[PDB]
Design a protein around this ligand. Structure first.
Ligand SMILES: Nc1ncnc2c1ncn2[C@@H]1O[C@H](COP(=O)(O)OP(=O)(O)OP(=O)(O)O)[C@@H](O)[C@H]1O
Ligand SMILES: O=c1ccn([C@@H]2O[C@H](COP(=O)(O)OP(=O)(O)OP(=O)(O)O)[C@@H](O)[C@H]2O)c(=O)[nH]1
Ligand SMILES: [Mg+2]
Ligand SMILES: [Mg+2]
Length: 331
């Protein structure tokens, strides 16, 4: 038989999922509009260089490429992630210089464009496009490097960093297959909506979607049951989330801070590809403590939802952490 609240989890997922690039013409059209804008802008930017603009190869990045995207809450923005590999040698150019090429290309597009430590972001009514900027591996020693650093960053934090976004995307796509991979992606989405619902008071404190995605890569485990008579398989998203959240909580470690003279709980989640960085490294110790506490509250609700006699009460317990799209059947 079907798991206790599985129907409501699937309805919740139906309500929060955003179709990936290959299934979403609106996202493809917005992405391609930005790409055309950067092509024409590069024409204009290199008009005063005496040379044709360098060409680039675009590729899908992020959750819309990995089929892990969620709809924003009301008032939020879509996040269109794309990479562009410019036909340039990384040692011949400064990373901030190349990102400034791209930013000046998009200077008069939409609400504007700005250079961020890891990308150039252009803004548009209801969504922003994050263009990660890379040098050509053929001209840069065979390595794919992203342009890191901003004008304010200075000198030490400005570099071409080895990067592997397509390797990461392959890792997320390949960890599981079929309906197992479906449950994996559903649980990443559930946690992204939890993030949006319970970290809205301080968006800087929120655990990034990339962090939750990498954590799922390391620690998600499928939860399913095979009927001993029909061999019919049913998935148990509530149990899968309970195991995954418990494993995340188990991987927090108290971490001394000499300035504050105390420990904070920290979850370290290495990217499984280059540059193998802790995707949570920017979160402060206090933000980590709050993250852990809300994770524990979510885990407690997942456990409570297993024991409620009334489906209404189990679903309400979950809605308290997942927000208004989680169905709560009447009692
Ligand atoms: N801190 C990071 N470390 C390594 N790679 C990152 C990091 N942040 C972003 N990336 C790369 O850029 C992509 C887009 O980042 P983003 O923060 O939009 O995550 P996402 O997977 O699109 O999740 P979301 O649905 O929350 O946007 C990621 O999939 C990842 O490949
Ligand atoms: O390795 C990376 C990192 C980041 N990105 C892309 O750049 C976007 C911004 O990445 P962040 O949200 O981590 O901010 P930042 O590193 O650019 O630093 P600040 O300017 O905010 O101080 C991310 O959402 C992602 O799409 C990559 O493509 N690859
Ligand atoms: Mg994204
Ligand atoms: Mg982004």
């Amino acid at each position: 038989m079907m798991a206790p609240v599985q129907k409501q989890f699937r309805e919740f997922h139906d309500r929060i999922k955003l179709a990936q690039y290959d299934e979403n013409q609106t996202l493809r059209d917005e992405r391609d509009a930005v790409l055309t804008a950067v092509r024409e802008g590069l024409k204009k930017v290199f008009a005063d260089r005496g040379e044709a603009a360098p060409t680039f190869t675009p590729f899908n990045q992020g959750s819309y490429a990995m089929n892990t995207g969620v709809k924003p809450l009301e008032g939020g923005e879509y996040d269109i992630d794309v990479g562009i590999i410019l036909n340039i040698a990384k040692d011949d150019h400064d990373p901030v210089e190349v990102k400034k090429w791209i930013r000046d290309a998009l200077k008069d597009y939409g609400n504007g464009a700005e250079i961020r430590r890891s990308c150039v972001t252009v803004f548009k009514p209801g969504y922003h496009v994050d263009l990660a900027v890379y040098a050509d591996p053929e001209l840069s020693g065979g390595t794919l490097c992203i342009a890191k650093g901003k004008e304010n960053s200075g000198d030490e934090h400005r570099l071409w960093q080895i990067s592997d976004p397509q390797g990461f995307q392959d890792r997320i796509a390949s960890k599981l297959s079929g309906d197992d991979a479906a449950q994996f992606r559903r649980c990443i989405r559930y946690l992204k909506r939890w993030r949006d619902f319970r970290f809205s008071s301080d968006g800087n404190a929120a655990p990034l979607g990339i962090g939750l995605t990498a954590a799922a890569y390391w620690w998600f485990q499928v939860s399913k049951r095979t009927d001993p008579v029909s061999q019919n398989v049913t998935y148990d998203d509530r149990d899968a989330l309970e195991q995954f959240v418990q494993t995340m909580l188990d991987n927090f470690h108290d971490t001394w801070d000499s300035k504050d003279q105390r420990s904070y709980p920290r979850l370290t989640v290495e990217l499984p590809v280059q540059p193998y960085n802790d995707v949570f490294e920017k979160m402060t110790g206090m933000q980590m403590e709050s993250f852990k506490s809300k994770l524990q509250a979510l885990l407690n609700a997942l456990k409570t939802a297993k024991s409620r006699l009334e489906l209404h009460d189990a679903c309400k317990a979950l809605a308290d952490h997942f927000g208004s799209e989680f169905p709560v059947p009447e009692k």
